Design a protein around this ligand. Structure first.
Ligand SMILES: [Ca+2]
Ligand SMILES: [Ca+2]
Ligand SMILES: [Ca+2]
Ligand SMILES: [Ca+2]
Ligand SMILES: [Ca+2]
Ligand SMILES: [Ca+2]
Ligand SMILES: [Ca+2]
Ligand SMILES: [Cl-]
Ligand SMILES: [Cl-]
Ligand SMILES: [Cl-]
Ligand SMILES: [Cl-]
Ligand SMILES: [Cl-]
Ligand SMILES: [Cl-]
Ligand code: NI
Ligand code: NI
Ligand code: NI
Ligand code: NI
Ligand code: NI
Ligand code: NI
Ligand code: NI
Ligand code: NI
Ligand code: NI
Ligand code: NI
Ligand code: NI
Ligand code: NI
Lengths: 150, 150, 151, 152, 151, 151, 151, 151, 152, 152, 151, 149
């Protein structure tokens, strides 16, 4: 019931998070570009991995994934702003951290709901994704001179 | 630049095309699934390649690529409808053919405009992408018992 | 952990039979789609072979004694085998695989439950991972057959 | 002297060159459900055919013979018949033509095997044997696609 | 080619039983040398599976109908299985594999002869290559056991 | 998550000392089977390092402070070390690896239990995956030693 | 677009004949330098094959009907074939390859001009890439023969 | 710069000098970001080397004679070298690489126009490809420096 | 003798075990701009430290020695001093600390070289020389990042 | 019962050992135009010859035999003759001597093929046949380099 | 053996005989440990073959004339070969490999000293690298045999 | 000293590299198809010595020559205009002369570094000398000659 619901919510949020990463990848300027620009590609690959896995779990459960930009934008809780070259490197990384914290919380909610329903395959998908996102939070926060502060 | 304008048109349309390919990938049902489902993955990778290359040619030119779903939806001439499992395999492939035919005509436009403005680097990007997309139209149309009808 | 051991051994038996059935599909397949589905069966057989080895060896690790003869496989399995027949349609063969896989998924579910109850978390995860991938196949097979997964 | 082993090897060169042309035609002119699988499958078959061609030709050279090596020689010596490319041939009909080409090659390789066996050319004999074995396995597979027994 | 088809099919059943025995050995092995012989059993199995797939699909190719159920395998195989037993020594396990391999080599020799007589040169080659490799393994296993190959 | 944090750090100390013990065995090993077990220790060491990095990083991720000095490892670990001795047999070296592994598996179970109770599901999976692998090695080592795994 | 189509088809026929000539060279080559030049013809044939595939398929893609019989290749090609002869010198062989390659290079230049005029830029690019590599081979072959490229 | 041969030869001398300058930067680099930018200079030099080989051998294919001595490179290049200095900062090193790339992109434009007017399409393509990647590097280099590409 | 070669090899065993522990600490406690490049760089260094550790200890074994092989032995014999991990240390302080360890290792390896050279143990001699070469390259690179000369 | 197959396998062991030694000499003492292609080509020939040696030797072991396994045994049993290395043998001569060795090996392999066939040893028979195939192909290519037909 | 060329040639003869001995060991081996030690002989032979090629070619490079006939090898080598014998135990086979390696290590020390005395530092390095790896093998072989390396 | 010969090697290796490029480009004659790519192999090996010896210089606290002018003023190798009408045999002879020079430079590097006790620099020269001298044998053999080091 609600496992399906949280899976679809992730499809929308992951689709918006991918667009944001792409913006950061494109509009980035400042010392650290040469390391953080390609890093955003590893992030988007990882984000797309969850996206594909979660929609197909949803298809497998007899659901209907969001599959249009209108659905993604309307249903996602993340918001987007116009690309701006003037944003600082640190600010871009902080934006990525924010997105990631949101996803880790969305994945937590996914774990709980699927746990309570006994959909253990879905539970695991959410657990694996959360683990990696949290490790990423640690490293970005470290780059930014901060504790992960989960 | 009109070259900048078309590169950005391509960013939006390729974003939408990518979304439509995902939908086709997810909602596909019928004989041929097993060959056409992972084939949508190869198309999406290729579309992603154009997306990043066209966007970064645009950045290189001093432009500012569309980088929010809002901008993609508003600027794209591609139309998205809700996902639907009861569409035929042959109708899904016809929809990909439509999208590709539009992309090939957009890339021709981009070729034209860049050729008129002496931007040969951009001219080449459009030409490589059109070539490959036109090859895919031939193959899709052959699967459908049809000539490419370019 | 008596019941976890017992369900690991059940899987050993059923996987062994599933493997045989998939091999029969592979060999006896005729019809449009052969060229895609014939090697597909090899992929499924490799994946089934991996559950078999992992489950059998978890059973050993736990102090069990896995079924290890064809006669044990055949009599302990709940899956039924019929003589190979070239005339079965592609579509019927795919449905036959779906039926086998639905059985395996339900058995892996019982494995999940039994082991969760006894607190054997390792066996739990083994069944959970196998169940995820079999269910994914069921979606794909059903989609080829023009149907919803109907799990 | 291996007169007939040499002769069947050159018959093979001619027949394999024409077979290659036919597969290329099937590859290009194919249309219908199953295109996406059978189209690249034709490249695999061509690659295999090309391997036989190069091996059988260079065994012939090795034996002191002179392989056919012009289109005119290929066409005039081959027993395979070519027709104009046509997009309105069905998939099942294209696969059926590949099967008849393959049945021919398999019968030709059986003749290569027997002739080389009788003349004591065991190397040539093994070449024809390996080629026959794979062509016959393809015939099984293609025939299966077409809902048929291999009927070797 | 009635006889070739027959011995190809006998090979399918015997290979399937050989595979199951190799799996018992893999699983139930205990004693010094486990760490080398346990993965070695995987290699033998992959090779046995290769013969199985190849001989079965030669049979189909000839117009035959491969055995394709466990019941058929057990009933048609000349190999006998017993319950797995951890108390068997490494020596005894390896000796058991040797006797399976000797049986298979002899069956492949019969395969070679019958296909030779019937003029089925492709089947003939399949049995010959398999026989070559099995015989090599017998040498090595025998050498491990301190013995001549004694073919 | 104070206790999950605590058992993660316990594991950092214990894995560090387990690592050092594996090095001793690798170096001081003598006897029949050296050539197989000497490199096998490298594979165990690599796997141990894997758990170590992952566990310490999970701890850093949770806002903890991993033990990171030989002093900390050696005082906090429950594993005891002794001077290297070439005169130990192969079989006793292997039995010492087994004791280390049984310790780690028990510790990984405590880690699973605790983390389950604080609802730290990520840390929980880490202990479960590591426990599954170590228990499998125990089976294998015991088999070499002619014994049941006896977990 | 009628002529881009005609030149792509001309190239289908000419590449088919060029391929055949390279094979003759490969087979009948004798003399010092056989050992590098014999497998070099294989590289050239693979390259001629790549153009053949790309140009026939671009033609298909534009609504054309590629030549696809040996009769069609032979009658439309401007390249002439003679019987293989082992007595031809290495250097005469390489000269014959140079003459084939110069013809192809001129054909690709006409390909380029015609496609350029009709606005078929994709076809245009295909000719230009092929012309570029064929001209580099011309340079290299001529350098072997102690000569300037002389394009 | 009279023609394609002329501008290709100019490219040969300028690329050789750009190669040397990139080497200088790689060696004398000091400051935060060394660990990224030091090996990045390798990638640039490798790419530069690529253009060098391509253009020189386009020039040889066309009947020309590439500069092939340091004297020729120094005297014909429009780039200016200075003595290596460790006290140049990372940001100044990168700005200098940008300056070299800006020069090369402009050379490549000239080569494009000249070859386009002469109808040497192959040479045209060579300049176009090189220019594309060089201009992309200026974007990235400029972004590291907090600036727009400013082509 | 080869008493002194054996002794320096074992000193390296202890110092490399401690160096390895220090690099792990830097790897984990690292915080600040540059983390993303330097954190995985610590892995590369540890891998190279462990290659040295494995080679020298086993040269020792090969020579008839008994390498140190307990955490107590490493801590008591090493001249390197360890302190508690601390996330407050800046990136540039962490790098400086790695430079100290490396300078110490390179000096030790010189000592290893001189001693093995004076003893005629040319195999052991080469091992120190190879390790010394790579460590000193790392010092140059680390110093460069810190805007300094190698100052060997 | 398999005495004749065993004897020819062992003959091959001795001959192959000596062939490997002749090829090494060719590799080492070669001088003249074409050195750069033919020098490494002798390594490929030697690896191939080593493959036949190991395979034929362990076929002999598999059949109950005792392979020759000493230089003395290889010299005494081989029918190939060795001469002192000489830098002034020309390239054409070096290649002609390889052809000589290869012609001898192909004829030895034909003998092994025949004997094993007569004894019903079909495994041994196929080993010789595959080796013969490959060596005869080498004779074609070497002769072609030399401007000659293979003259098998 | 009065110079570097003379000791290089001595190594050619001795490595040739060592190679022959290792093949005998590989072939005539029987007993527990066969499966590990039979392929290990292959690795030792590849290594010995690499010294042989490097030392012989160094000798050529120095103006020398390497032994290159079995007669030369056998008459110049100090190693003695005996007839193959299957009843030699595995430990006896490994003990013989150790004796050969001890001889080789001593030869390489002599090559090291001689080339050092002459200032042929390239030859010196070759003997030093070979010596190091042979000594490491002696350690590992002796360890299998439950012994110190005793160099 | 070691620093000094390290830098001389930077200069000479740069010029050797440029000479090898010329041989690569201007080559004509039977054997082109073998020798033209061999030049790339040599060029890569030279570039590897350049990088190693230069960074050893940097590592010892010196300042590598890093402009074409310094390369050319300091190298003892002579450069001539490219010429398509040189025989292959003549091409390979010029390469031999360059490598014989480099080999002798590396012996000087070896001798000086051993004297100075800079063992790391010593091995770098020893490794490069070994490979260059092996190339000399092979080139000479192609030329029907003994290596004559
Ligand atoms: Ca049917
Ligand atoms: Ca027991
Ligand atoms: Ca025994
Ligand atoms: Ca002992
Ligand atoms: Ca002639
Ligand atoms: Ca001569
Ligand atoms: Ca004895
Ligand atoms: Cl700008
Ligand atoms: Cl022991
Ligand atoms: Cl000639
Ligand atoms: Cl000569
Ligand atoms: Cl000792
Ligand atoms: Cl000399
Ligand atoms: Ni997907
Ligand atoms: Ni990008
Ligand atoms: Ni297993
Ligand atoms: Ni060929
Ligand atoms: Ni199969
Ligand atoms: Ni880490
Ligand atoms: Ni194609
Ligand atoms: Ni080049
Ligand atoms: Ni080790
Ligand atoms: Ni062997
Ligand atoms: Ni060699
Ligand atoms: Ni460098």
């Amino acid at each position: 019931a609600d496992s399906k619901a949280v899976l679809n919510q992730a499809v929308a949020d992951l689709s918006v998070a991918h667009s944001i990463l792409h913006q950061v990848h494109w509009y980035m300027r400042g010392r650290g570009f040469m390391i953080w620009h390609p890093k955003m590609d590893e992030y988007m690959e990882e984000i797309d991995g969850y996206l594909d896995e979660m929609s197909e779990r949803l298809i497998t459960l007899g659901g209907a994934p969001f599959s249009t930009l209108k659905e993604f934008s309307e249903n996602s809780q993340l918001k987007e702003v116009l690309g701006d070259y003037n944003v600082t490197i640190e600010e871009q990384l902080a934006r990525v951290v924010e997105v990631f914290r949101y996803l880790a919380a969305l994945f937590q909610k996914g774990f709980d709901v699927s746990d309570e329903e006994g959909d253990s395959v879905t539970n695991d998908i959410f657990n694996v994704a959360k683990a990696s996102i949290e490790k990423h939070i640690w490293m970005l926060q470290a780059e930014l001179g901060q504790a992960p502060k989960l």
